[PDB]
Amino acid sequence: TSGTLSPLDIYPKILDFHPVTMATFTMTLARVCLCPMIIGRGNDQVAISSKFETREDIAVIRNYGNLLLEMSAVVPDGIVAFFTSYQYMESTVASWYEQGILENIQRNKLLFIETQDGAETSVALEKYQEACENGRGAILLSVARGKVSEGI
């Protein structure tokens, strides 16, 4: 089991065996959840080709940095921004500590970088649960692979 697994196929694919299948909980309406996607809103919004997303500065600066700032400033709640790597995370949020002078988010968020420490992790989750946008799981950046995935 893995919580969800309804399309079923991947587990029998990985096993090379065909388990007995069964769904064995009563679920709740779709309406308590909402699962959005974002890409742009006018025809001039061309900076997201992602032929080299790891190198496309204009694309990082445009809806990748700018939509995050619009969504976070408008939707003022505790929100965690997951990234594919540290290097992306560092480029997207200028933060207090910037990788360059030329980076495109200015807003109070918290970091979650390597050498995470078990005690230091909790400090950031204490901050996010208590108040304000920022903390661990709050307006904070973390790579999706990293420890924040354990949750609280």
């Binding site: 006018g42 025809n43 001039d44 919004q45 061309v46």
Partner: protein, 475 residues
């Protein structure tokens, strides 16, 4: 079934042998076959509705432009290219937008999207030079394949867009009119296929119309702000280029920190001793001068310059006639710009007007129109109703006027004025101008009195002064 169907050219007509009996035309007009004007090829909807089709067996298979890069246009312009993908040649052919908001970019993008061997028609070499400056992102190997193609030389696959030329007909070197049978059209005389026209109002004139009429011309696009002169030829342009895909771009959709809200006004001015004697008695081209120079109207124009200079607004005053221009401007001791003012002295006056807080009013003649990087201001006064086109008043207004600071999102922050002499042929232009500006979305009003003109120093304070001008004007 059209798998064998011949189609051929005679002097300005297409004749169709052993036909499929296509909709919407006369039959056996003088032989068993169908015969139309070349220019009728544009009616692809009449067969498309029927479910009929055709083949270009006369084709030539050589190479074409790619221009893979893209750029970002204004929000309605992007909507306007998106529509053109939607509609296709059966239901496309002109776009209308101001001469100061991105028309060059629509032409280079319109050619980069349509992507065919293209001939670009323009009015002026300066506009070729602005389109070159726009086009540098899609230029092949930056500066080693762009060339001009007009009365002095021709070279290379591309240039200001693709090959650009001028409308002109002075002799064999004035390019598009003399060349109109050599190159042209993918379906017959089949070297190229796509036509892009800048300043499109220029072609439907009686001699010029023939450039467009004497071909089948597959794809055509036109771009303009003036669209027509006072006599409205525009029904012809639907046939000649194609139907109008867009018109609007209202300032109502771009207020809060974006362009301007303009309060438009017309000003009715009364008529002072001796000037109507003479207006009523004279039927000749001088009579235009007695209704423009009418001193009660001059005093409104002076009072209006004083009000907006007291607030340090920037003002361009338009005068349709070099006599009128100099008689107003020398009296009000404001610089003027016209034909015979040189480039050096114009660029000094215009730099002074834009950057010097002491130089806040200038006077300009017809040379701004269709082209003169006119400068920015916040106030426009026209001394007369003219005969250039109600639509050119709106192009000229739109390209010149912007919001004054602080107030960048208010109901109005820029001002347009047109001065009219009561009890003259100058009044006739109003019911049309009023209807055209309000249909263009503008707030427009009529001002009929100024009882604060009776509270300050202004010109023509006496009959004797007015008589001194009346004798000069009559001569």
């Amino acid at each position: 079934i059209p798998m064998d169907l011949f189609d051929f050219y005679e002097q300005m007509d297409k004749d169709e042998e052993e036909e499929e009996e296509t909709q919407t035309v006369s039959f056996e007009v003088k032989q068993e076959m169908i015969e139309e004007l070349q220019k009728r090829c544009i009616h692809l909807e009449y067969p498309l509705l029927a479910e009929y089709d055709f083949r270009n067996d006369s084709v030539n298979p050589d190479i074409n432009i790619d221009l893979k890069p893209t750029a970002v246009l204004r929000p309605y312009q992007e909507k306007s290219l998106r529509k053109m993908f939607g509609n296709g040649r059966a239901r496309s052919g002109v776009i209308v937008l101001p001469c100061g908001a991105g028309k060059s970019l629509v032409g280079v993008t319109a050619a980069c999207t349509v992507r065919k061997r293209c001939l670009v028609l323009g009015n002026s070499a300066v506009s070729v030079e602005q389109w070159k400056a726009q086009f540098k992102m899609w230029s092949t190997i930056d500066d080693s394949q762009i060339c001009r193609f007009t009365s002095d030389a021709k070279d290379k696959p591309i240039g200001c867009s693709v090959a650009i030329s001028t409308y002109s007909m002075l002799g064999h070197t004035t390019k598009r009119s003399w060349e109109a049978e050599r190159v042209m059209e993918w379906l017959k005389t089949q070297e190229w296929g796509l036509m892009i026209l800048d300043e499109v109002h220029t072609i439907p004139a009686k001699m010029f119309r023939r450039v467009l009429t004497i071909v089948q011309a597959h794809c055509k696009l036109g771009l303009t702000a003036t669209l027509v002169r006072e006599d409205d030829k525009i029904v012809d342009l639907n046939f000649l280029i194609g139907p109008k895909l867009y018109e609007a771009n209202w300032m109502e959709l771009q207020n809060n920190g974006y362009i301007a809200k303009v309060q438009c006004a017309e000003v009715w001015c009364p008529m002072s001793p001796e000037f109507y004697r003479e207006y009523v008695a004279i039927k000749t081209k001088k009579r235009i001068l007695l209704y423009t120079m009418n001193p009660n109207k001059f005093r409104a124009c002076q009072f209006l310059i004083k009000f907006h200079e007291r607030r340090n607004d920037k003002i361009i005053v338009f005068a349709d006639n070099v006599f009128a221009l100099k008689e107003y401007a020398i009296r009000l001791n404001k610089p003027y710009i016209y034909g015979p003012t040189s480039q050096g002295e114009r660029m000094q006056i215009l730099q002074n007007f834009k950057h010097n807080p002491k130089i806040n009013t200038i006077f300009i003649s017809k040379v701004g129109d269709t082209s003169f990087d006119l400068p920015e201001a916040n106030v426009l006064i026209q001394i007369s109703s003219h005969g250039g086109s109600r639509r050119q008043e709106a192009q000229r207004l739109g390209r010149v006027l912007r919001a004054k600071k602080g107030m960048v999102a208010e109901e109005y922050n820029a001002f347009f004025y047109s001065l009219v002499s009561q009890d003259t042929q100058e009044m006739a232009y109003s019911t049309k101008r009023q209807r055209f500006l309000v249909d263009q979305g503008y707030s427009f009003k009529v001002i009929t009195k100024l009882a604060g003109m009776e509270e300050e120093d202004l010109a023509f304070s006496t009959k004797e002064e007015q008589q001194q001008l009346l004798q000069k004007v009559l001569a």
